[PDB]
Amino acid sequence: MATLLTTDDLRRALVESAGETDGTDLSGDFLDLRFEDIGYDSLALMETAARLESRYGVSIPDDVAGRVDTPRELLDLINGALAEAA
């Protein structure tokens, strides 16, 4: 019932966590890229998660958001969460 995060939607989340997101070419297959390269702190990934929590109604522990190596993992986390959420 909840909209499973797509590529564009996940990209939206990764933008919201910083506000502006220049330099970081994110719109062009970003699932297996590394946060290190896109200048993303795992602390900021908790922001990414939080954005989606408050939006979708999911529950993402901050310990988890900072544990994701690739956005693929972040995506699957919330896709799984959504599948057992709504």
Swiss-Prot record:
It comes from the Bacteria. GO terms for cellular component: cytosol; membrane. The keyword Phosphoprotein applies. Keywords: Antibiotic biosynthesis, Phosphopantetheine, Phosphoprotein. PROSITE patterns: CARRIER, PHOSPHOPANTETHEINE. Pathway: Antibiotic biosynthesis; actinorhodin biosynthesis. The modification O-(pantetheine 4'-phosphoryl)serine is found at S42. InterPro entries: ACP-like_sf (IPR036736), PP-bd_ACP (IPR009081), Ppantetheine_attach_site (IPR006162). Residues 4-82 form the Carrier domain. Pfam families: PP-binding. GO terms for biological process: antibiotic biosynthetic process; lipid A biosynthetic process. The keyword Phosphoprotein applies. 4'-phosphopantetheine is transferred from CoA to a specific serine of the apo-ACP-like protein. Acyl carrier protein. This is Actinorhodin polyketide synthase acyl carrier protein. The lineage of its organism: Bacteria, Bacillati, Actinomycetota, Actinomycetes, Kitasatosporales.
